[PDB]
Amino acid sequence: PQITLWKRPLVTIKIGGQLKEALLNTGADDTVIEEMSLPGRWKPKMIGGIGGFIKVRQYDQIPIEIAGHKAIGTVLVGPTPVNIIGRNLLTQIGATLNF
Amino acid sequence: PQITLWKRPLVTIKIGGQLKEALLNTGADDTVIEEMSLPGRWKPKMIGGIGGFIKVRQYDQIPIEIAGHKAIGTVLVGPTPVNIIGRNLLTQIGATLNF
Numbered sequence A, B: 001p002q003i004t005l006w007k008r009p010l011v012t013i014k015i016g017g018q019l020k021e022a023l024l025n026t027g028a029d030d031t032v033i034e035e036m037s038l039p040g041r042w043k044p045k046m047i048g049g050i051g052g053f054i055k056v057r058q059y060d061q062i063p064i065e066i067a068g069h070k071a072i073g074t075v076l077v078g079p080t081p082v083n084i085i086g087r088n089l090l091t092q093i094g095a096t097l098n099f
Helices: B087-093
Strands: A010-015 A018-024 A043-049 A052-066 A069-077 A096-098 B010-015 B018-024 B042-049 B052-066 B069-077 B096-098
Touching (some): B052 B087
Antiparallel strands (some): A096 B096, B010 B018, B052 B069
16 A cells, blocks of 8 residues: 555554454554564563663564564563564565655 | 665754654554754653653654654653664655555
């Protein structure tokens, strides 16, 4: 699709068989999701936002569907204000910015 | 142009007679620029994201050039870690997400 930006670019994602809403975010290096249960081991990660830095749990190689498109990659879990799909997965679904 | 998302989508902007580098940010409602002087009235605002909130000055009807494209809109000024072009000005240059 072609998504204009008059509204927030929110899409439905699927992770661990559950549907969630998430924001397609070209300003984010990484993908960050609200607290949830994911399989496997996690590693520590610090990420920085507009208000400062927070600690999150890094899970690698997680299957996730984004607006119907399949991806498998790193998902960070932590106290984010909104679920965010960052460039690590935007590249997997072939997303570009155009003007 | 078509901008891939392998790296941060940085572009050159001109604002208040100054050249700056800024991030094209579809996950941002607003445009936020590091400390600088702008003409006209302003009012205070709190904006939030990962890590909490910062206080910024809101300037309305500010002319800007973004990667060669002219627009006008609200610009927030304050202690942001990176200059951000948000959706309020991304729309004006006709930027879309495509996949």
